[PDB]
């Protein structure tokens, strides 16, 4: 289930690995654009459902009434979306999704406002009174299967990107040949063979007489691998 419009939750994502390449590459997405970044490289994710016209109007640098009224964006990161018509549209109308018609002031970049506070709309002090020349600021749209592209609901995520690591690529270990290697952060060239030494559990690399890094624990199957130079 998605945050309803004006019931937004920008989730902080950190201290984990994530694969943006996979999220990006899937054929299920309706749209995808990045701002100074690229998903092929692999932090917040605000996940919600809005109408197609708003999907198109709420984006970094995009001017429009609704962006200024909902979630104003300038940012470094990506905006991704996928049509949710078969999740959110209901027969008779899904009216749980409010849109803002009237507002006191505009939003600052990468700022959102979920308030329902009554606005005088430049004229009348409603103070709980029905909106006669003053208004309840929001009005919902009945998402129904029978609707156009700008009205279909889409699930939209604003992905800010730092605190999240991409996956690492490993290849098969090759032994008894001269290999150009990279173990975690250790690089060099030599022949990789089994070692007869053992390391304490937290030690990852070992040293020769002048501190050349030589022995290493294999990152997937910790064992001591012997690194000796080629002739």
């Amino acid at each position, epitope marked *: 289930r998605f945050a309803s419009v004006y019931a937004w939750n920008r989730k902080r994502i950190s201290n984990c690995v994530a694969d943006y390449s996979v999220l990006y590459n899937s054929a299920s997405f309706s749209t995808f654009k990045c701002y100074g970044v690229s998903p092929t490289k692999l932090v917040y994710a605000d996940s919600f459902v809005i109408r197609g016209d708003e999907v198109r109007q709420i984006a970094p640098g995009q001017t429009g009434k609704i962006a200024d009224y909902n979630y104003k964006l300038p940012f470094t990161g990506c905006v991704i979306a996928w049509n949710s018509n078969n999740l959110d549209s*209901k027969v*008779g*109308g*899904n*009216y*749980n999704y*409010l849109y803002r*018609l009237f507002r006191k002031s505009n939003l600052k970049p990468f700022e959102r406002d979920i308030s*329902t506070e*009554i606005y005088q*709309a430049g004229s009348t002090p409603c*103070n*709980g*009174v*029905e*909106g*006669f*020349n003053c*208004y*309840f600021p*929001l*009005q*919902s749209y*009945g998402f129904q299967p029978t609707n156009g592209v700008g009205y279909q609901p889409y699930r939209v995520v604003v992905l800010s990107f730092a605190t999240v690591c991409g996956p690492k690529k490993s290849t098969n270990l090759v032994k008894n040949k001269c290999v150009n290697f990279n173990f975690n952060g250790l690089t060099g060239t030599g022949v990789l063979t089994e070692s007869n030494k053992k390391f304490l559990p937290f030690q990852q690399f070992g040293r020769d007489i002048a501190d050349t890094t030589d022995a290493v624990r294999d990152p997937q199957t910790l064992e001591i691998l012997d690194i000796t130079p080629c002739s």
Partner: antibody
Amino acid sequence: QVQLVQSGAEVKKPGSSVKVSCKASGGTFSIYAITWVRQAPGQGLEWMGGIIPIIGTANYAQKFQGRVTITADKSTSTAYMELSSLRSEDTAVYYCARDFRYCSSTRCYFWFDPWGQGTLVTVS
Amino acid sequence: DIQMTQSPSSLSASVGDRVTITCRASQNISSYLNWYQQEAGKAPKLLIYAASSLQSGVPSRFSGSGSGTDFTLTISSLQPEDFATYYCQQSYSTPRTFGQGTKVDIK
């Protein structure tokens, strides 16, 4: 859109309380005020008060201060009103209405488009 | 609130005839003056939406407009539901005020 359907008639005497609530149908319940209107024996209507479930504070008629308490719960889909300070002159049919809104851009209209059938209170 | 006056209280007409009902406000509002059609024990419908159209879904049997605080609306062919009491409401403020109520009267 929501045609609010009420409780049955009260057969109590003047000064007693009235328990009336309406069950929602349609859709679009949490937004726009749930209001109540009184129907006089014979003719004449008066607004008593109402509430938007989203805001939760309501607004009431001065004519009904001490008589009308109105609430609503968007999580229940039920409209509620309780009557007190009841007198024999308050014999009436008590109705649910929705304050349904349409917006002509800048200017909006809030109307009792949906209605209930009305709960009769026979105190007379 | 705005005081509403609605008249004639009793109209002489029968089904299929032309019936004119008027309502006047104490305040100069052009579109929040609208009428409802109510029978006791039945849910009422709003007849007029924002002065210019019909809320109830009526195919323009009724038509009207106002000037100043004076609103007039007429039906070209009177129907059985027009014997319901028409109530003129001014939605603009609170408590909402309704007029006395009018209808076609057959004895």
